[PDB]
Each structure stands twice: as C-alpha cells, then as structure tokens.
Amino acid sequence: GISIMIKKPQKSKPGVFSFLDPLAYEIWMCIVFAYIGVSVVLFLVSRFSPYNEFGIFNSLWFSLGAFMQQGCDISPRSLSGRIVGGVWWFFTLIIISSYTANLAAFLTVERMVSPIESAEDLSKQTEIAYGTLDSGSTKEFFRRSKIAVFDKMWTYMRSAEPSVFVRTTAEGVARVRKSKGKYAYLLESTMNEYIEQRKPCDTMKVGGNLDSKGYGIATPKGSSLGTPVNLAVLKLSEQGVLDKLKNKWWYDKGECGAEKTSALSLSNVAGVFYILVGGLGLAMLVALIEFCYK
Amino acid sequence: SGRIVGGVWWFFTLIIISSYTANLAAFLTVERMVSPIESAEDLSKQTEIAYGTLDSGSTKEFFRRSKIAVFDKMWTYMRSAEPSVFVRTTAEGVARVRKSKGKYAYLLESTMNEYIEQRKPCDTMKVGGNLDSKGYGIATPKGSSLGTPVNLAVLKLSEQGVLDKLKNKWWYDKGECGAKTSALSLSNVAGVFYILVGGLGLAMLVALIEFCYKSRAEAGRKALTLLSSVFAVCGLGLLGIAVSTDYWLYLEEGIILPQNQSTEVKMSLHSGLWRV
Amino acid sequence: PNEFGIFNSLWFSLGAFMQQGCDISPRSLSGRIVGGVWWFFTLIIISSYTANLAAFLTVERMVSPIESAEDLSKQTEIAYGTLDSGSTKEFFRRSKIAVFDKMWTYMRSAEPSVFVRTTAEGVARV
Amino acid sequence: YGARDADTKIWNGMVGELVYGKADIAIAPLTITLVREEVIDFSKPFMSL
Amino acid sequence: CFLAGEERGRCFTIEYVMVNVLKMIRSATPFPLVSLFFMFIGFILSNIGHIRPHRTILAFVSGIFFILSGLSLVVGLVLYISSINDEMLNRTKDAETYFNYKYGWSFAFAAISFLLTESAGVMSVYLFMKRYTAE
Amino acid sequence: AFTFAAFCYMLTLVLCASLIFFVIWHIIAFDELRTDNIERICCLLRKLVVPEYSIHGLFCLMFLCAAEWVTLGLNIPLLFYHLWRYFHRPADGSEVMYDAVSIMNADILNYCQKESWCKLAFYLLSFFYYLYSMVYTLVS
C-alpha cells in the first residue's frame, strides 16, 4: 500500500529554552504567581500585626532567597510570619527535588517520539512537506480519490513550491536524508521496509497503509498454468512460506539489526547563560536609572 | 552541648533529602522505561501480559503450524499456561480485555478489531500491525456467468475508492469515538500547592489571632503547674492504655483469585507486644 | 548607593555557585537582580550536574556482561565468530533449536568476515 | 462459514450452500483459504486483513 | 580554508561560495565584532580621561564600555559554541566516522581576551574612585 | 482538574480574604473620624490603601495569564476606578499618599462614604465569586 517515509526521529536541536523542560509550562507559571503570592502574604503579616523590616522590596528578596536555595539574610520573627516561611520552604524542597529528579529521567531514558503517526497527522499541519514520485500509481492515487483526507493532501502538493515531486525513487530517499526531516516521501510500503533495512539506517515507515493494492504472479490469458499457480500461491501463504521468505529478504539478509549518555553540551544549558547576561544588562540599566533619579 | 544537636540534625537532613531526590529520580526513570506493546515480538518476551485466542477457528490454527518462530514461542505459551488463556467466544475475549486491566492481550482479526475500538465503550485499541495477510473475497459458485464480471467489478470498486468510502462509512463514520507530555504536570506535584495555599491561609488566620491577643491585652505561674501534671498523668496513662489492649498491627493476610483479582483473606492478627 | 568590593563580590558569587550563601547580600534593586539571576543560574547548572551524574551511574549499571548464548543473540554490537572449517560451523548451519538459527543468520550475512580461518587468529582478534 | 466434516465430506454453511446449488454469490466475509479455492472461485480480495 | 582534504589551502568565504556548510557561525558572526566595537569606543575614552582631568565622569562611562565589551563577548562565545554543538548532533549517525572539533588558538585568545578586558574595566573603575572621590 | 487557572482562583481567594479585612479596618477608622484626630487618621489610612491598590493590580495581571477573560472583565471596572483613583485626588505633599489632609468635611467625606460602602460590597462579591470558579474548575 501507499505509506509514509520520514527520517528516524533525531535526538534534538535543543533550543535555547530547554532548561525548563522537566517541569511543565504550567508548573513554572504556577511558581511565579505563587512566588508573588507568598511574598505578599509575608508582607501583610510582617507590617500589619507587627511584633517591620520586611518591606515589599525586602519580602520579595526573602522568597527569592528561599526558592533558589541560597538562604536568607532576614528571618521572620512572628508566629504567623514563620508559617509563611515554613510552607514556602517546604515548597522549594519539593520543586527543586522534582526538578533534579525529572531531569535525571530525561538523561537516562531517552525516547524519541515521531512528529506524525498517520496521514491525518500529516494533513493537520503545514510544517512538514510531502513528496511523491512524479509519474506512477502513487501520483495518480491522490488525484482520483474523493475520501477528503487524501484530497486535502492533494491540494497541498498540487501547488506548493519548491517542487515537492521527484523524478526517481533514489531522489525521494535522498530528499529525506539530506533534508533533516521536513520531507515525508510516499513510497509503496514494500520499499519503505526495504530502504529502512538498508544502510545508512536513517528512515523509518510510520503509520499504516493508505491504499491496499496487491502483487500477483501473472500468467497469460487462458494458459494452463493459471490454475496450478493460483492454487499454489494460496498453498504457500498458508504453509508460512510466503512469510518465512519475507523475513529473509527484508529483515534477515539486512542492515540495522533488531547507550553512552554523553555529557551535557553547552547548548542544553545555553538558555540559562542568555538569561544570565540579559539579567545583568537589565540590572545595569537599573543602575543608570537609579543614578539619574538621585 | 548545643552544636552537637545542631550537628547530627544537619546530617539527618542530608540523608533524608538525598534519599528523596534520589528516589523520586527512580520513580520517574522507571516509569519512563515502560514501553507499550507495539509488536508481536514485544508481546513475545512479556510473561506478565498474557496472550489470548478464541478456542475454535483459524486464529489458533495459524499459531500451531507456524514456523516463523516468533509465533512458535507464542504458541509455546498458549498450550502450557494456567489458567486457560483461550477464550471460547469473541464476546468473552473482549470482555476479558475490558475487565482485566493491562494483563490480557486477545489476538483477533484486524477488521473485527477496528470495529470494536470504535464501538461503545471505547475501552480497547489495536496495537502494532497485521501478523499474517489473509483476504476476504466474493465467492462465485464454480464456473458460472457471474465469475468474471464480479471479479472485474471488485477491481473497479477498489480503484475508484468505493471499498474505502464504504469502510470509512461503517468502521469510522458510524463510530462511537473520534479519530505523553514527558514532564511533571500539576497533577503530580498537586499537594504541594495545596499545602502552600492552605499553609498561607493558616498564617493570616493566626495573624488575626496574633493581632487581637497582644494588642487588646494592652488596653502564667500556676497555669504551667496545672497543665503539665495534667499532661503527665494523662500521658502516663496514654502509653499505659497503649501497652495493653493489643491493637498495634493488623495483618490482613490474603490470596489473589485471578478472576477479577478477587482479594480473599487467609488469616488476620492483632499482636500487641507479647500477645498474639 | 559600602562593603562590596571585588574582594567581596568574588565572594557573593563563590558563595552562590556553591549553594552556601554568605553574610553579604545586595540591598538595592540594581544589585538584587545581579544576585537574582545568578542564583537561578546556579540552580540549573548544579541540578543539571546532579541529574546527569545520576545518568552516567545508572546507565553503566544497566550494562550486563554476556553470560549466555541468548544474551549474545540480541547484541548486534558484539560480533560473533567461528573457525572457517570444522564441526563448529557445522553445528550452527543444521541447528533447529532456533536460538542458534538466529546466530547462524548473523554469520552468513555479515560484513566483514566474522569467520576466522585459524584458532590462532580467532583468539588474536579477541 | 465453511467446513469439511471429514467423516462425511460435506461442506457446511456458506460454502456449503454455494457448492451445493442454492446460492449464486456470497458477498460476505469469506476468508480466501486453500481448501475453499478448490471447490468455489473467489474474486480478488476486496478487503485485506 | 581546508587543510587536508582538497590539500590546497584555498580560503573560501561562506557568504556565497559553493557536509560542512559552516553557516552555523554565520548566525553568530557579528557578536565578537559587536564586542570589538564597544572595546574601540571604550579605548577612545580611555586616554582622553587621562589627558583632561577636569571633567568629572571620565573613567566610569569609559569603564562601562570595557564591561559591555566582555559581556557581549561571552554571548559571542556561547552562541558560537552553541551553534557548533547542535550541528554536531543533527548529523546522521554512522559508527565508521569520527567528528573531532578541537579549538584553535584565536579562540584561546578570545578566551584570554575576556580576562584582560574585564581587568581593564575593574582597574578603570577603581581609577574613578580615586580620581573623582578626591576631585 | 487542577490547572493553572484553578490555582489562580485559589490564591486570589485567600488574598481577598484579607482585602475584606482592609476595608473593615478602613470603614471603622473613618467611623472614628466623623463620629467620636486628623493626623492619626492621616497615618493609618495612608497605609491601608496602597496594598488594596496593588493587590487588586496583581489580580488583573493574574487572570490575564490564566486566560480567564470573564473574571478579568469583571475586575477592570474596579480597576478603572482605581486607575483613576490613582489619578483623582493626587492631593499634595510629594509623599506616597492617600486620604490625608483636612477631612471631616461634606465633600471629601461623601467621596469617602463612596469608599466605605462600594469597596466592601465588591470584595465580598469577589470572595463569593472566586469560590464559585475555584470549585467550578476543580470538579470539572
């Protein structure tokens, strides 16, 4: 059948925000608003109902001094002001122990998930480009279809430039590799299980069969081989000879087969250096604004 | 005298925290190793998840005479197993997958499988691909006149897409459903945020109490003597009632009856300290 | 607008990269940002060190030595080997135990030649 | 669907009503086996499974 | 400029010449050059603070550009090295091939360049708190 | 289903539970003014307001990020007041400011009687509204 061919899902180009991957994008947002939140409730309990020093500029500095584990300089002295420091401290012992713990889970067990998992997943996007052969059954199949998933998939490659078509099979293979997968070629599914199992192991067959054709041993019209062939192809398929001899040529007489955990590159934590220098440059702009104010 | 109590308490909070960070990093990297069954072979090795086949039909008969040897090991399980992995009916075989969570992995024909995942309730799905390749067919009787035009019609309906328009119209369109995040979500660390906000709420509540107590008293000796001996002779008797009337450790010893997992006891116990 | 010279500002940085804070703290909004995002820099670099040293030591603890035929059946990294003439090849070729059948399936279709010619050579490759 | 009761060599069911006269076509899920394409003819497969 | 393969040492420029595409640094090219510019204008205001002592704020404003030279150089360094590393990962794996990426000595200068041009900043900013605090 | 927006109603509830404590200490302090003291009522009531300006300013930036436009659209008519209550009566002094110089009159006191009823009305309206959508999300 018609099936999809993409590059084996590569590790990453880890974008320079990737430090905050272990927690979700809704826990890091709950922290910031529970940062301001527990800084404020400290401030109310410190100024009102006094025993003081904790201004709203100084109670933010206590809670930044309690989340980054770097300790504090000014301890709360009241029964209600310590319970603010009591449950914000236990907050940061869990969220830092859930940050270290989940980041030790990314680096030990690395699983690469594929971007697409169907033809619908290729239809519900514009980021990855398709590709077929220019002249053949794979070409003609989308055009005469009316099933509306394979019709949306035809309207794209009808128009979209640069040219999504190829002129030979080895072209379409070598437009996935050399293309850092953005190009999903559409083979017949017997060649997808061939190019995957031949070196360099770079491409895999995702999803299932779109169409369903069938290869057949052909005999000329009204020949007397027409009956024994037909009753032997069925006989081989039941005696497991058309499968044992499929495992041999695609897989067994084949490549790939069935880690090391390298050190963290600069690029993984490179998002923090940019926040560091940008956190400096914004402070030196506060230096000039404070000085001109004086 | 006091820098020892502050000494070994410090060392106590270096081992309890570093046995918490280093154990929460052993849940989250052992449920990340957990891979779903996505092949025959990945169901060959699992002795935990059990197999399953209807007790009469081509599906058993495929494994018994198989020589592909992934399937031979799969038949090697299904003979020698307890209890019976072979269901008798595909109504039962589905109903074991429905009930027995993650244990039972019934093996059936692909076009019966896709019309059960899209049929109420959606409690099942098809993993992996096809093991073998059968084919359905239209049967002409032996040599009749309707044997070559039917054959030339079922090629025409295949190419125009009527056999695909008709599959989507009965498997999918009259269906009953549609069609990993790799990170901690707010459900995981939930109770920290409750103990936070619930913690702050107890602070401002006591901040009202703190305000009323030491400011409206603006506009002791015997109480310690009273309450402490009260706490004494109660607490002297608290451990006294504790050390007798033997209820320290229940032990609901039991066995598993694997049908619905049917937790059934074997004995019980309430050992005190010298009295079982 | 002191206590913060370069002999004391190389100490509220070394007292912040190691997570043990010193007695010096910035007391201005101009300076509590430099002390702010440096702190957050030493929460990610340390917790990407503890959580990576706990990913060497649990990935070289998974490493199991080959202690069986089957545990050498699955490894496509470690290569097989048999002398090129004798009963040892002839055992695999006619084997039906099917652990050994996969092992013969490697040794035909492999590059380069896994079959040494002599047991002096075959040892010398190990 | 079909059977070959070996005590009596009778086709049962759908193939047993299409060998034995009283049907002309069997538009229904018949699995293309070997023992069935010796006594009745099948079309090319309309559904692969 | 190639050294071993195509042995002739022809110094291409990846602006529009011709895997080794090398335009990973092309996204990160101007950032040592931007730091070089703030080091030029800091050096201009270095000695004219010495020539005239009568103007007050001459060491500090100059001293800003000595520090901004260094911080722009670090982001120059990181985005250089960050752009090398990811290009060394998206290469399709082959266990018959090795990619070494050892650094030169101008990068060793640029590393040492940070150390000196921050020292110039710290020394100039101590000059401000002996000049102006007396004057 | 504890999401981020479900957290935001939890936080603004326990915050506005001391916003009603602001206004109750705000009305009783001015009950001591017109009945029953200009420079003490200066000091105590300059303090209380700048929280209840700013904490409600927190509430408007929170539900912006929680994408709760209904509850965002609710608070902005109180914010429209406080954005202009920041602007209106900027009395004098170059101090922080508020509610403080020359009170016990008829004009500014009615401008302060507008504060005494409308603030406690909204903050007890909000405390019941926040407990609605807090529970409404967590059981959904």
Ligand SMILES: CC(C)CCC[C@@H](C)[C@@H]1CC[C@H]2[C@@H]3CC=C4C[C@@H](O)CC[C@]4(C)[C@@H]3CC[C@@]21C
């Ligand atoms: C103080 C000096 C160094 C200048 C001010 C800080 C520099 C580092 C600032 C802080 C936020 C930065 C950014 C940080 C990251 C992005 C994405 C990266 O792909 C290219 C650099 C780029 C686009 C920025 C360059 C410059 C930048 C604006």
Ligand SMILES: O=c1[nH]c2cc(C(F)(F)F)c(N3CCOCC3)cc2n(CP(=O)(O)O)c1=O
């Ligand atoms: O020709 C055959 N066609 C069949 C077609 C189907 C269906 F899928 F319904 F189309 C099924 N089912 C699948 C599961 O068991 C209940 C019904 C059985 C068939 N069988 C019996 P087999 O021996 O088990 O293959 C045939 O013999």
Ligand SMILES: O=c1[nH]c2cc(C(F)(F)F)c(N3CCOCC3)cc2n(CP(=O)(O)O)c1=O
């Ligand atoms: O009867 C036999 N006895 C054998 C005895 C030995 C030894 F171990 F030295 F005793 C060996 N070697 C092992 C390795 O290769 C070099 C010598 C080969 C033998 N062979 C040839 P085979 O066919 O390889 O078994 C026989 O035929």
